[PDB]
Design a protein around this ligand. Structure first.
Ligand SMILES: CCC[C@H](C(=O)O)c1c(C)nc2ccc(Cl)cc2c1-c1ccccc1
Ligand SMILES: CCC[C@H](C(=O)O)c1c(C)nc2ccc(Cl)cc2c1-c1ccccc1
Ligand SMILES: [Ca+2]
Ligand SMILES: [Ca+2]
Lengths: 144, 144
């Protein structure tokens, strides 16, 4: 898609651990972190964090059941987030992110650290703005 | 101060818990979270997260010993962060943030949740842009 308030939220798996990945669809900018379990409370808390940092209007996911828990619904309610309906499911940051994590994996002991390193690398890599520059440009324009 | 890459990082205490608070000095925009202990590894991990999300050039603090641990130094090294020298120590988001947390405290069970709610409220409150609008404007301008 490409509206500036649209984000996509999914979980991946690596080293037996769960990584929550959010993508700002218009820019390719990512936020990701290892979470202790793939549960509604983790997703809800992550969304509240995300929404305080960026103007999150709608969220999409590739696993719709992710958004059925009462706790997640309460988080979208409180932050005024709606579900996104304009992106069809047609069955990949996850693998690109995983590629980077593999590249920097030995630079740190804990997977959670490597994930943040990969997020950093991803957001700053120019390809010609970087995703990090694109998101702030997109958002600022949309404000003014 | 007011250069766009300057952040300030401090910890506060509430309900026997530790809250790490980072302020983008130019805008007043905040990121904050409860951390399990006031240690170097927590600070280092937080800085890496922060640096992947915003262009962090220099960091200041009101407790200089916060930045003496080897792990913190390694995080600033990896992310290319330097210590800020242009802000003198003259002995307050912490209390403003605490005010908001008090106001929304019953809206959630866990302090960590209320903290994210307070961060959200703080960043979006207009007073006339909001801190959230100011930071992206400041950064985007500085890019172009
Ligand atoms: C971020 C904190 C955890 C991190 C890790 O690897 O997951 C870590 C740990 C556990 N311990 C350390 C001890 C010494 C040094 Cl220099 C660095 C580190 C680093 C480090 C590795 C890369 C960059 C910064 C710190
Ligand atoms: C964010 C997850 C933890 C949060 C809390 O309070 O710290 C929480 C928990 C533990 N349990 C819940 C059960 C039901 C509902 Cl509707 C909401 C929640 C909420 C909630 C409260 C406010 C906003 C969203 C969820
Ligand atoms: Ca329930
Ligand atoms: Ca040491």
């Amino acid at each position: 898609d490409c509206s500036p308030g649209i984000w996509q939220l999914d979980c991946t798996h690596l080293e037996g651990k769960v990584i929550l990945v959010a993508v700002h669809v218009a820019s390719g900018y990512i936020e990701a972190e290892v979470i202790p379990a793939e549960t509604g409370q983790e997703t809800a808390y992550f969304l509240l964090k995300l929404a305080g940092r960026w103007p999150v209007k709608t969220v999409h996911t590739d696993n719709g059941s992710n958004f059925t828990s009462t706790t997640v619904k309460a988080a979208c309610w409180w932050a005024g987030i709606k579900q996104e309906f304009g992106i069809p499911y047609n069955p990949s940051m996850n693998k690109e992110l995983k590629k980077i994590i593999g590249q920097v994996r030995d630079q740190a002991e804990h997977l959670k650290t490597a994930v943040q390193m990969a997020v950093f690398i991803h957001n700053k890599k120019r390809k010609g703005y970087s995703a990090g520059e694109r998101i702030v440009d997109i958002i600022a324009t949309d404000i003014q």
